[PDB]
Amino acid sequence: AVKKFKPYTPSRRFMTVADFSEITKTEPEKSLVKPLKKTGGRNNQGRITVRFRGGGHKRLYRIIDFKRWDKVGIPAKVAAIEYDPNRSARIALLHYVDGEKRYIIAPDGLQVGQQVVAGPDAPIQVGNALPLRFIPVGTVVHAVELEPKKGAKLARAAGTSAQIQGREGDYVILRLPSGELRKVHGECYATVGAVGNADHKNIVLGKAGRSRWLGRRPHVRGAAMNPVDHPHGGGEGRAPRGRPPASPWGWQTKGLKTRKRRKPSSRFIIARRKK
Amino acid sequence: MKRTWQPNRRKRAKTHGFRARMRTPGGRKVLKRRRQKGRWRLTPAVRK
RNA sequence: GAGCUAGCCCUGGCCAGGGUGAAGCUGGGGUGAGACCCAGUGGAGGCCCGAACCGGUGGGGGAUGCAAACCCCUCGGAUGA
RNA sequence: GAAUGCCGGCAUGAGUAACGAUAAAGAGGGUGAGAAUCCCUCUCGCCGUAAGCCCAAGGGUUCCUACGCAAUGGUCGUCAGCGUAGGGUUAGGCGGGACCUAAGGUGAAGCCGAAAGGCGUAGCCGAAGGGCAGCCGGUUAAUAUUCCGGCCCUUCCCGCAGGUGCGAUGGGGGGACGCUCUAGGCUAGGGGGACCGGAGCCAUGGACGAGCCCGGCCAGAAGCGCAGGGUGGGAGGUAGGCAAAUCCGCCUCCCAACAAGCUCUGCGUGGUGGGGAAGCCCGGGUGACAACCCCCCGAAGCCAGGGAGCCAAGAAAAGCCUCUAAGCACAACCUGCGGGAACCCGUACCGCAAACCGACACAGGUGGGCGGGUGCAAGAGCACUCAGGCGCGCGGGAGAACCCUCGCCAAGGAACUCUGCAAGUUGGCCCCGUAACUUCGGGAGAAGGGGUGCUCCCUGGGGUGAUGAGCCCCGGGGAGCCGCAGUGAACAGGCUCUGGCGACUGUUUACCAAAAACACAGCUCUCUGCGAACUCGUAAGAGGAGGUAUAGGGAGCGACGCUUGCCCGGUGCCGGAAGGUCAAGGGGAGGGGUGCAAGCCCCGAACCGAAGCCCCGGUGAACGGCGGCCGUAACUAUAACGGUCCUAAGGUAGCGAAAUUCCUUGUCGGGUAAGUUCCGACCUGCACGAAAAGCGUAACGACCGGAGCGCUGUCUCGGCGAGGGACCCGGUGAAAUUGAACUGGCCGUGAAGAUGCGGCCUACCCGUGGCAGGACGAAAAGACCCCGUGGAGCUUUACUGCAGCC
RNA sequence: CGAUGUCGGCUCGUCGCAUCCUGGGGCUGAAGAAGGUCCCAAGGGUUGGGCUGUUCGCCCAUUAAAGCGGCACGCGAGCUG
RNA sequence: UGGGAGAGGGUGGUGGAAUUCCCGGAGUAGCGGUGAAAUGCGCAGAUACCGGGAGGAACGCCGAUGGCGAAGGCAGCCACCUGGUCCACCCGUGACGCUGAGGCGCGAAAGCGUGGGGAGCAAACCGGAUUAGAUACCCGGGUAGUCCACGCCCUAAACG
RNA sequence: CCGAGGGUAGGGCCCGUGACUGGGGCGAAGUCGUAACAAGGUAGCUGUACCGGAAGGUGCGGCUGGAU
């Protein structure tokens, strides 16, 4: 339920903020937070390799449990739903009857005080994890391992999900959040439900300052630069692209496909995304 | 206005000093050259 | 060679005083219940006026200079990108 | 003898400019060979959120003292940050180290690279962050939380006593954290006292006073008192915290739970120890047995790890505590007490500056803390002042032009000019009042006005205290008084109307452009299924991201509103198992050389044979493009209509003489006495047009047009006045430039613009203040222009390669 | 071309006369008054404003008249820009 | 009080037919379309046929001249929540009624905003015919939209 | 003190007028097509939406004031 502001500054006209109404605990679990090392887009050469990064708010990384087959058959209680600034989804604090505490990413509908569990025998309730084979066909699922024991890889951003569509031998067929149909191995784990905080897409950042807070430095259009900078640089006055529109490094940026041709995972992609 | 020399003893020693020169092929050549030329100082003096 | 300058990283510091008065909250009214209205409270903001601080708009001076970019009057920002 | 030659020397300009902020000086007395310049006294002025004081960097003896003045000091010099000499910096507690980690750096393991080397978990290094024990005073010519005095504390070693399952680099807790706003109680700091202490003072008309002037504190262990922070206790279960665990986590139960208790800080008190003014007298002595008290204001600092709210969600590690593991339990650890032990480095001085960075004793630059009083609504603003610190290291005269900075002006009031450029006007606060339009916030300080001092009288609430007095902060009512004038000085918006562009706050060509440029939220296209795409790297490895399609890369457009039409023939990109072409390779019809021959060797057609290209489709918020001629209506004109050629398709809505219109000052209307600009229209748009977006848009703008009001020295049109210069005298003394010069006007001549040639005219010799017509004046081997088979940046369907990708 | 600064303005003038005005004339299709045209004449004079960077030009209000041209399209070691 | 019929409304669930698309098989020279054609599609293997998958929308027969609602309007089946309405008994209240300016709510389709969805259909648009023309009618394509959620719009031959 | 009114500044309503622009009414014999009235040669009308020289066309839903 994104929140609006009254136009009492120019920027407050359009700024919207998340409602945070689902959050129940407002400082993180000290036993689970590390320092997130800001990079600014710089690699171990010191070189910028991702332009326009840097200068955003300080953050602590919350260690998230993406395996869950860690603790088969051990139920846990949902103690808190918390804000996590390293991801779009919210996160849920789990108190295992073990005494062990862990963060998962919070699916839609998950409630404080309910219990979740993981394993081949788990009920088909929101927040449980099962190998893909034991989830009935048609189930909307999230936090999906791409390969067994390798960690939840797909459908982790706010509001997203994959849907189980069918089986074929050792493999399950998923409609990924992009619309691609892919075979994923059945021993891969996934969590029942869709990721929460689905209102996330409808936030209007509102002003230039807001992007700075997120660590996003301003983008410069190639058309604004000079020929030594960019294929679109130069020209007296304004200028159309005057060549097929290109990236700063010369390659074409309207249409030019880029996935590697002979990639082994092609045998497992059934149908490319659409829209 | 603000000029270009803003001295700094730590900076000086860490940038041009004996140990920074020895660590690197080009730095060791500098020392070899300034010795061959007979320089009284192989390295910029800084107080510490 | 980044002790100038540009960007980023870590860790610290600074921003007189005054003005405006968002949301919410409380109460009252209103209704089937509501939206909603009114008062109070509240203290939001790349909000307003203005020092420090950061700038450099117009003019005048300076032009073997006080200065290889300064000086005076004026002017922009000043809780924020 | 020339090379704007090289090195050096010395001239010219010239006793010229200048002598570095216009805060400012005068006199008396000393010293000395010599004094505007040194020392002392009195007077005057300047800073006073500093131009005072304390830290940090940087500097490195510049500090203090004696002795000096050749040079350095923009003059002088007896003086000095200068010369010579001697002296001076004292720490368990301050800062750094023998502690901790951050970015980063380095790097056993390991990975990679022709060599050099590049990476890399742990670990190590790395601080202005964490952690950790000293406060007040006195003393020196010069150091002081360092010496001394007083009162406090830390750790290490050893011993005694009491206690305890003791023991860690391992587990856990804690350390541990944002931004805005902010409560209570305090301290710092400050104001007043008719109270307390003090050398005195009575002036010039008055005052011997509840008179003036000065001062009225600082530190302190235990204990205690006020105010805060931190913190549940017990039991049972236990599979988690990579061994163990009585700890931590999770579950259950019981009790205490605005508490309390325990603990830890701050403030107050506190044994004790110190300080102590003006004035007078020679830094000192007195004051003085100094006194040391009451009231009020009051932090942004303290209690603190406090509270609330918000979203952009806010280091680490050690110290510390707890748990246990080897081990050891004759040990070990914990508490208390005693004795002993306690190292290395810095410490002088300058530090918004004459000692640092700017070649200079340079109007520039340099981070943190303190920064007093009064009044002006507030404040770090402004004026004047305290403490303190200065008068800026050339002076004396004069009182021209001219220049700079400044003040005023009759009548007019933008007539100035590219332009109200500049300068006026306006200006704070309180009150009344306020338009189109609007996205309902705004526009708005709209506009426009009224008030503002002082005195007396009456009085409302808030704070303190006590509920009163007193102090204190906001006020309100009545009546008066004075001046030209009451934010009486200083600081402090001119306003309106209407266009263009850009939504907006922001950013930019350091040092000629701040803008309409960039950015920007937002919109769209496109790539990317994760060992992602993309980027840097030979690689390893990184970034992306400890992210996962509501995500990340690339591109265009640029809030918002209403919209974004037609063309896929060409280029791009996407799709297409056929077909055509196609390299290495396969294949080997068929030849060839050589040998006696077996054989050895070479050429080699068909045919099989990828990507790419061809070919078939798709695709515009991909690159791009969106016609011509002729005819036609019952006045004329003009063509809704038609004919025909062409194209892949022939520009739609909206806009239009425009940031675009050549002809052009188009034409008409508005404003003006008059309008090449402006605004509104028309549409034959040289040459608008829909995300290189089209048309609008409230608000915003040191952007660029046009108009009006206000007011003015902008101007008619100038005048006077001020100070700093210019000028004269004393001191110190440059510069570019310069073939040599004994260097006039005209009209001619001359390489075509003559002081220098011809003819004539004019003219005694040398300066000083001024002005700029000439010396094709100076400066810069023209930057425009061309030339050189000169150079460099940039482009592409120029050539030829290479990375990369296939 | 080892540099002769370039439009317009402002300031300051000076010169030529093919004369705009004023003075003297002849002719007139000159009644007067007012003009036309030519001759002599350079002593003096030759306005303020709106538009545009403009020179020029057009317009407003006047005037005896609102002359034209040269001086490196006079004049940037005089200013503007 | 006791009963009744009903596509009355809202939420969630769920079932079969058909179309389209995709994959596999089999199979070959046309299919499609019309008044007739052409564009289109098809040897790069279409159409017709079989099996498999995905997705959206609408609910055949029953069905009616029927039923329900105030109107707009409402139709597979199931469950929940909910409205009106009729009948019987003659038990309760004792005129508590009628209408209704304003007000408030509802209000087919189209259209609008923000997400989503998108099979079929189809304004615009393109192409093929027709025609003097054909910015139409007919044919092949085809985008909004048609569908869901929330918020707007408030119109009608909203008619008996 | 009040006070006719004069001045300054800013609003509200009304009238007249304005380059140019929008449709409307009317006008003996203009140009284009033929939308409606018959099934008007595509039944018509309808709210809306989009498009087109023009009447109109078409989509969606509605009406019979439709024919056979």
Ligand SMILES: CS[C@H]1O[C@H]([C@H](NC(=O)[C@H]2NC[C@@H]3C[C@H](CC(C)C)CCO[C@H]32)[C@H](C)Cl)[C@H](O)[C@H](O)[C@H]1O
């Ligand atoms: C700025 S003054 C600064 O530069 C000056 C120099 N002049 C010239 O070069 C002239 N020579 C002819 C050329 C012609 C053109 C014709 C035109 C149509 C382009 C006019 C411009 O120049 C003139 C710059 C270029 Cl004006 C002088 O060297 C002066 O001595 C110095 O001080």
Ligand SMILES: [K+]
């Ligand atoms: K040129």
Ligand SMILES: [Mg+2]
């Ligand atoms: Mg908003």
Ligand SMILES: [Mg+2]
């Ligand atoms: Mg609003």
Ligand SMILES: [Mg+2]
């Ligand atoms: Mg939430």
Ligand SMILES: [Mg+2]
């Ligand atoms: Mg930790």
Ligand SMILES: [Mg+2]
């Ligand atoms: Mg990272």
Ligand SMILES: [Mg+2]
């Ligand atoms: Mg690295």
Ligand SMILES: [Mg+2]
């Ligand atoms: Mg990048």
Ligand SMILES: [Mg+2]
């Ligand atoms: Mg970056």
Ligand SMILES: [Mg+2]
């Ligand atoms: Mg993310």
Ligand SMILES: [Mg+2]
């Ligand atoms: Mg979150």
Ligand SMILES: [Mg+2]
């Ligand atoms: Mg798999």
Ligand SMILES: [Mg+2]
């Ligand atoms: Mg979004």
Ligand SMILES: [Mg+2]
């Ligand atoms: Mg952030």
Ligand SMILES: [Mg+2]
């Ligand atoms: Mg962005």
